[PDB]
Each structure stands twice: as C-alpha cells, then as structure tokens.
Amino acid sequence: SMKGEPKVIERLNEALLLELGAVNQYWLHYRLLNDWGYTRLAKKEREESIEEMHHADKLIDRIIFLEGFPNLQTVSPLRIGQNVKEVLEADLKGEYDARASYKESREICDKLGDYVSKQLFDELLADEEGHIDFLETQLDLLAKIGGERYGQLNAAPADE
Amino acid sequence: SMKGEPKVIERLNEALLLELGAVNQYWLHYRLLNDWGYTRLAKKEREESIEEMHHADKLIDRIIFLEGFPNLQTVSPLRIGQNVKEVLEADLKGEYDARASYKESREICDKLGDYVSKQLFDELLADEEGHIDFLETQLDLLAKIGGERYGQLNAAPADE
Amino acid sequence: SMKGEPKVIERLNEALLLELGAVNQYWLHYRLLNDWGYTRLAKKEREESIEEMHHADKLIDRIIFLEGFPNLQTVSPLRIGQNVKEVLEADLKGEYDARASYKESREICDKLGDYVSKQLFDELLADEEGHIDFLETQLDLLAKIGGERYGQLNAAPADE
Amino acid sequence: SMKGEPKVIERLNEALLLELGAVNQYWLHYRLLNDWGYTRLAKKEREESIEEMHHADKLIDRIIFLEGFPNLQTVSPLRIGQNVKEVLEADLKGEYDARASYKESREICDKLGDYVSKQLFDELLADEEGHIDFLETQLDLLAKIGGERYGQLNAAPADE
Amino acid sequence: SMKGEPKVIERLNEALLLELGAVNQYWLHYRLLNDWGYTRLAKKEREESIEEMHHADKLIDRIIFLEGFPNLQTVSPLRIGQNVKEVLEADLKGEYDARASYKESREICDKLGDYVSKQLFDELLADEEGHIDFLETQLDLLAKIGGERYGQLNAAPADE
Amino acid sequence: SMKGEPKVIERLNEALLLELGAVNQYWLHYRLLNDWGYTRLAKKEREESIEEMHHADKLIDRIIFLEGFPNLQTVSPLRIGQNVKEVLEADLKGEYDARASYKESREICDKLGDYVSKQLFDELLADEEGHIDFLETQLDLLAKIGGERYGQLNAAPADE
Amino acid sequence: SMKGEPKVIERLNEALLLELGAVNQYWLHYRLLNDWGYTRLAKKEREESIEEMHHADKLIDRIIFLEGFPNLQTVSPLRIGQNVKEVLEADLKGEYDARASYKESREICDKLGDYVSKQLFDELLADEEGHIDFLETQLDLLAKIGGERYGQLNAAPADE
C-alpha cells in the first residue's frame, strides 16, 4: 500500500540526478581550487560536496521507501570553472537549476497528496536558497574587492 | 615539465570511472540491504562505499597533478542485486573488473616511466584484493550455512 | 650432576614433537576457519595454538636444563580438516594422542626418580584434558544443533 | 577467479618452509643463550623469533587466499650454534638464505603478473636486510671488542 | 656478502650530493626569506630543509650498509634566488633535477637486482613529486594574485 | 589422630636442618660478597637466603601440625667461599645436597601414605632445581667470560 | 574415549556424598551458632560451608567430564552439635572421615592411571588437612581457656 505515485518517484529521481551532479561538481572544484592555491575556498567546496552527498542519500531512501528504484547510473552534466569566479558562477547556476526542479517537485507532490515527499522537497529548497545566499554574497565580495584580492583572502600562507 | 603521459591520464580516468561506479553501487546496496532488514551487512556496504570514495579522490588528485582533466561526468555501469547473494556477487564481479584494470594500468605506467603512478595503481590493486578476499569469504559462508541463516546473522533485532 | 636420564630427555623430545605439530595444526585451522567465515571459532583456535606454543617453550627449557638437546627440526604429522566438524575432530584426535604420550611419560619419569619432570607431564596432562573437555563439548553441541547452525553461531556478521 | 599461479604458491610455500625454520632456530637460540647467561642477547633472539612468526602468518594467509594449501608439515634444516659467535653466524647464514629466496620469488611473481605477491616478497626482503644489518653489526662489534667482552655486555648481573 | 653493486653505491652517492645541496639551498632560502620579511614562507622553507636532511641521512645509512663510503665532502651547485618568485623557481628546478636522478636510479637498481635500494629511490621519488606539487601550486598562486600580494600573504605582521 | 609418621617427622627435621644451614650460608655470602664489592650478586644472595627462610618456616609448620617437635637447635655444616666462584660452587653443592634429601623424603612420605607431606617435598624439590639452574648458569657464564669480568658485571659503580 | 574408569567415578560420587553432607552440616552449624550468640564462629562456619560447596562443584564437573552421572539425590549422615565444643568436634570427625576417603581415592586413581583425578583428590586432601589444622587448634584453645571464655571470644557485643 506504500507504493508511491510514479510521478513522485520520477521527480525524486530527477532530483537525485541533479544532486549527484552537484556532488561531483563541488568535489572537482575542491580539488581544482586546491591545486590553484585557494585552499580556504577549496575547503568550503568540500563541505558543500558532502552536504549534497547527504541530500542524495535522503532521496535514495525516500525512493526505495516508495518502492521505486533509484537511478545512480547517470549524472547530470557538470559545469567546471577554470578560475575562481567561474567556479563560483558554475556552482550558482547549478543551485538555481536545483531550486527550480524542487519548486516544481513540491507542487507535484502537493497536488497528488504525497505530503511527506512535499516536505522533503521543501527542505531541499530552503537548503538550496541557503547555498544560493552564500554564493551570491561571495560573488558580490569578489566584485567589490576584485578577483586577485578575493583569491588572496581565500588562500593560505605556504606554511599551512 | 610535470605534464603527464596522456596514456597515463587515460588510465587514471578509466580507473576513476570504475571507482565512481563502485561508490554508487555500494551505496545503493547499503540502502537496499537496509530496507530489506540486513542492517549489519548494510553497514559494511556503507563503509566500502566510503573507501571507494577515498580511492576516487586519490585518482582525481593524481590526474590534476599530472595536468590532466578528471572526468566525473559519466559513471560506469552499475550491477544491482535483488537479494543478499546477488548483492555480494554483483560487488565481487565489480572488484574483479577493477583488479584487471589496475593490473593493466600499473604495467602501462611502468613501461612509460611514471613510477609514482605505478605505485598508486599497486596500492589500489592490493586494496581490491582485500575487498575480494572479504567477499569471497562471505559468499563461501553463505554457501555453507545457507542464505536464510546468512541473512539472519547479518540482520539486527527490532530493538536496534 | 644435573645430567638427566636419557630416557627422560627422549620423552620430553617426543612431547616437543607433538606440541610443535599441535602449534602448526591449530594455527592453520585458525587461518582456514577464518577464510571460511567462522571467525569466532578461528579466534579460539589461535588462542589454542598460542597455549601449545607455551607448552613447547616449557619442554625446551626442561630439556636444556637436563643438558639434553631439544629437537625442533621435525614436526609431527598434521591433521588438517576441510570443514568445521573435521577441524574439531582433527584437533580432538591430536589431543588424545598427546594425552597418551604424557600419561606414558609421567610414569617413566616416576619410575626413574625425576619427579620434577613427572610434575611437568602431569601439568601438560591436565591441560590436555582441558582442551579435550572443550572440544568434546563443542562437537556435542554441533551434533545437537546441526553443522549449519553451529557454523552460524561461530561466524561474525559482515560489519565485524 | 582468485585461483593463483601454482608457481607463485610454490614460492610462498618455499618461503614458509624457511620462515618456520627461522622461527624454530631463533627460539632455540633464545633458550640456549639464556641457559649460558647471555640474557640480553637471548631477549633480542626471542623478539626475532616472534617477528618471523608474524612473517610466517602473512605467507599462510596469502597462500590460502590464492586457494593454495600451506605446508606446515616440514621445517627447513636448522643451524644451531654452540657459543655466541656461532649463534650469530648461524642466524646470519639463515637470513642470507632467506634474502636469496625472496629475491628470486619477487622476480617470479613480477614475470607472472601477481603484483600483490611481489609486494609481499619485497616487504620480507627489506625486513631480512634489516635483520642482516643488525647481525653484521653485532658480529663486527664482537670482533673488535672480543668474544668475552661481547658476552659480558650481553649478560645480566645476577640480581636481574 | 652484503657488499653492494658499485653502480648502486655510485647512484646513492649521486643522490646524496643532490640532497646535501638541497638541504643547504633550502636553509639559505629560509634565512633570506626571513630577512626580507616573508616569515610564513621562510618557515615552510626551514621544514623542507629538514625533510631533505632526513633524506640525506637515509642515503648515508643505505650506503654504509652496502659497505660503500658516503661522500659528504662536496655539495652540488646551489641555486640562490634574489626575490620570492626566484626562490620558488630555484627550488622547483632543483626538485626536477632530483626527480630525474631518482628516476634513473631506481631503474639501475631494478636491472641489477637491488630491490631494496630500488624501493628507497621510489620513496624519494614520490616525496619529490610531493615537493613539486607544492611549489607549482605556489607559483601558480603567485602568478594569479601577483607577487606583491603573494608576498604579503606570506609575511607576518610586525607584532609576530 | 593427626599424629604423624615418626619417620616423616624425622625427614622434615632433616630438611629443616639443611634449610637453616642454607639460610645462614646464603646470608653470610651476601655480607661477604658485599664487603668485596660484588653488590649485585650480594643482593641476589640475600633474596636466596630469604627464600630458604620461607622454606624453613613451611617445614616447621608441617612438623608442628603433625604433632612433632621441630629442631632448630643445630645447623647443618656451612660451606663458606673465599672468592666469587667458590661462593657460587659452595652454594651449588648445598643445593644438590638438598635435592637428594628431598628426593629421598618424598619417596618415604609416598610409601607411608602421607601424601600432603609428599607434596611439600615435591615443591621444595622443584624450587631447589630452580636454584640449581640459576647457579649452573652463572658458573657457566663465569667460565666463558672469566672471573674478573664476571666480578665486574656483578659489581656496582662507586656512586651506588 | 574420555569414558572414565567406573571405579574412579564411584570414588568421586563417594566424595560428592561426603561433601554434600559437609555443606549441610556446616550450614546448620552456622545458623545454630548464630542463634546461640556465637556470631564470630558462626561466620567462619558459613565460609567453611561455602568452601565445601566449591569442592562439591569440582567433583560434579569431573564426574560429568568422565561421562559418569553425579549423585546428588542422597546426603551423607550429618553430625549436629548441641553446644560449641560439640559443634567443633562434630566438624572435626567429619573432616577426618573425608581425609580417609580421599586418601583411599587418590591411591585408586593412581593404580588405574587416572592421574588428573588423582590430582583432584590430592588437592581435596590438602584442603581437608587445612580444615583439620584449624579445628584442632580451636579445640585446643577451647580446652586451655575454657568453654565459656571461648564462647565469649567468638561472640559479638549486642550492638553488632
């Protein structure tokens, strides 16, 4: 009787595909930022990757509970920056994509009466707008102090 | 001058594709095993997933150090079991695949003189034969005590 | 004047040959039981091996004190099981062999007046009947609950 | 599929035979050195015996993992000294024997593609050259200060 | 019998000459960087010097073990920068020199069968590629934020 | 009814006479060894004296329990060395004397059915063979390193 | 093969019958002595009862190990005193009975070659002669200071 709405499972798998992409994008940005010297921003990027990992684990559990089958076989297309600002903007564009898919999804769950899944999307939505606030603030800072000083701020001295 | 052999980067990206697949396969097995009640085996599967995550992070770092570009965009094809034995056998088949790709890869690094990458593959190889010893032992146990008692052993009572 | 009865040294070297065999038999059973998944029984087998190691060290010391020369060059013939019950029965047959050699030996020491060596054999004898009680009990349990449940009981879940 | 190269199992069993011999040789030297009063050298000999025990346990595990059958039934021929220098020289000759068998063995594993076993022999090799450095140094010391002062140095006062 | 291949001792002495040079180059860079105010980079340079000291001590021990005679009498030619970027580039050029000598050397040890010395060079090689990753990253950072901001980042305030 | 076999009391009093002698011999050796400078051997001699004291107390208690009367009025003839080796040999000769009296005595207790006294002699016997092992080892050491180095080893520096 | 000599099991069951009697006799003496006010002697009697309990448990285990069947169905005839001295004398008479049965029994085990059971009787024998020493001493004290002062000594003040 716990069999879920197939449209709801579709939306959760759609969210999962986006999360898996975000996990990989953030992790590669972490390693790239590190190789370039921006170790403080690299660290924040690692943490963001791990937060998306947790979101992906929540979606899988909800999908399997609804007796759907979670798709981990494919990953959404990654946006890979080649300097700091591009990395921040690549991440921002991904969060806005996620925001819109979750906005759509909570409405679909609502209309079909799966209120617990609705609640799951509403929580992912507020998390994303969290990540979005952070990134927009960093990009505004980068813009007002300039890329090279933003880079220096987010870099460690050589003895660390 | 640190520019790496393109054949060596190819092999590391080939390893990365297999690791990312293994990460996803183990994680889904964790959640599936959990939904079926096999919580002790599910836990070991989570740990295995996280170990592969660490291997994938090592390959990315080596690829970026060699000034190659790591591919996280695609994931190797997953093997998804539908009961305990199939889960163990799906994992085993994946480890043997990894063993063979790393065996090939350390020989390619050796011939081309990239001894530090050789060492990286040799370490992944011994880890895989570790995972392989574990799984073959579990499958032998399953075979000698039978699937239902193996399942019970790897399940928790309801108060845990 | 501490020169010992040559017949007494012979008996101690005979005991040493049996102990060295038992040390090797128990250790191989430990590793085998482990490879098959029976990790709790494997652990007890390791401890038994180490106890025999200690017995072998006691015999060597007594032999050298009596100015005899301990023979470590050859090992008595090993009994190697191919499943749990055979492992337990191979060990039992070895302990009964040891019991009989020590029974004979304490009588030889007694008749020849080497009472301290007599005491050494009497202590090995009571230890062996200890090991014998343990094994007979395990085999009775195996018989009453059946090999597959005895195997499961002596196996660990996969997360350990 | 984990079935190992029979030539590789042969070499591991060959190593095991040498290790078991070394375990017994070092242990008997420990007890002998003790009976003669050279308690500090006796202690080091006990530790060496126990290190070889650990090497023997590693070989057994690798053999059983490769689905070979480890031979513990026979022990390689022991070299037994009758004074300090002979004990040190008997041990040295044994380590050089082991060095050469492991040198041969890592090359055989390499040619046949069993790189994890290669790594195992390379680790035993560096350990042996460790034991060899120690013994050559002790023998040089014995030579420069003379056997009786070397004996005194490696003996304890009577209250210990 | 521990007499080593003369070609192997030559290569270890060649490595020693390079290490001693690196020890002196890093130490002088430490003091120079300090005099110029770049105290955080100076500290990392001191640590690097001390790591090379440890490498030099490992080579000496291996040389004396192989009954060769280590040459400490001469030091390889030093590269001495006159500002931050030149200091980093002088160090990088030295590490690439070391990388190539160790690459050559492990192959010579391999061909001649001195596998433990091979392992020693392979460990120095991976350490050097470590130092090389660090320096290339610092130089990329210097390039993207500019020398004066890189200098400021690696300088301490006057109260420290 | 606890009245003991008069032959058994005789043997215990015979043992007591030997123990009291040994107590006095060891104690005088302690003080003598001390006056000569051999303070480490002197200490061991004090401990040996005190162990014999404990043996003498055990015999007295057993004698009084058997309602015999323990003879402390006379002491067996003492062996008093005039240098280190003579002290060790005087002690050894005394232990062999004790060994033989206890060997005889446990047989007399056995034949007459006083098994608890038998056990008492068997315990004194194993203690004596303990003391005998120690002394024979010390004398062998003295022989192989020479009296003057054995003396030095068992002497303390002047600040202790 | 662990089947025991039927004569040996008979003797152990004979010992068990005596121990069970002693357990009950000591316990009733404890309660009686308590009711009469002799609380310090009552306490010692409780401890003695519990020691016999432990002896009885040892005999049962040995009987079941020898695949005999322990008889707990009947208890040997109890000796119940009506004042302090009679209580002490009733206990003494019981210990002498036990002494003689164990003396007989160790000889029977010896002749039939069951040396581990021999050792068990020898240990019970020395324990009994322990209990016998204690009681004879208490009765001698009672005799020399008189029953009423012995009673007072073994009584507590009313506030305890």
Ligand code: HEM
């Ligand atoms: C389905 C995809 C993934 C899932 C479900 C997932 C899940 C998780 C979770 C729940 C943790 C928390 C472990 C802990 O700290 O207790 C974790 C940690 C981690 N993740 Fe992932 N993750 C995924 C993808 C990735 C990828 C692609 C990488 C690439 C390197 C990665 C790297 C790591 C690392 C290094 C850790 C740290 C583990 C440790 O500290 O021992 N993860 N992951």
Ligand code: HEM
């Ligand atoms: C003459 C034969 C042997 C003797 C005299 C002997 C003696 C001993 C002793 C006294 C110990 C106790 C060390 C301690 O825990 O403090 C020990 C430990 C051990 N034994 Fe043996 N043993 C023998 C045979 C073997 C064999 C054939 C193996 C095969 C692997 C083995 C494996 C071990 C191991 C792994 C340890 C643990 C050492 C540690 O924990 O560091 N032994 N042995």
Ligand code: HEM
């Ligand atoms: C210009 C030449 C040298 C300078 C300026 C120098 C300086 C120093 C200093 C200040 C330390 C103290 C580090 C500490 O313990 O906190 C040190 C440690 C050390 N030195 Fe040197 N040294 C020189 C040459 C050498 C050489 C040729 C070797 C050859 C092996 C060497 C081996 C070591 C080692 C092994 C340490 C220990 C570092 C540690 O404990 O981590 N040094 N050195």
Ligand SMILES: [Fe+2]
């Ligand atoms: Fe966050």
Ligand SMILES: [Fe+2]
């Ligand atoms: Fe997310």
Ligand SMILES: [Fe+2]
């Ligand atoms: Fe997000």
Ligand SMILES: [Fe+2]
């Ligand atoms: Fe693992």
Ligand SMILES: [Fe+2]
């Ligand atoms: Fe992996």
Ligand SMILES: [Fe+2]
């Ligand atoms: Fe793996």
Ligand SMILES: [Fe+2]
């Ligand atoms: Fe045991």
Ligand SMILES: [Fe+2]
């Ligand atoms: Fe034994």
Ligand SMILES: [Fe+2]
């Ligand atoms: Fe045993």
Ligand SMILES: [Fe+2]
């Ligand atoms: Fe060692």
Ligand SMILES: [Fe+2]
């Ligand atoms: Fe070894």
Ligand SMILES: [Fe+2]
């Ligand atoms: Fe060795």
Ligand SMILES: [Fe+2]
């Ligand atoms: Fe470093």
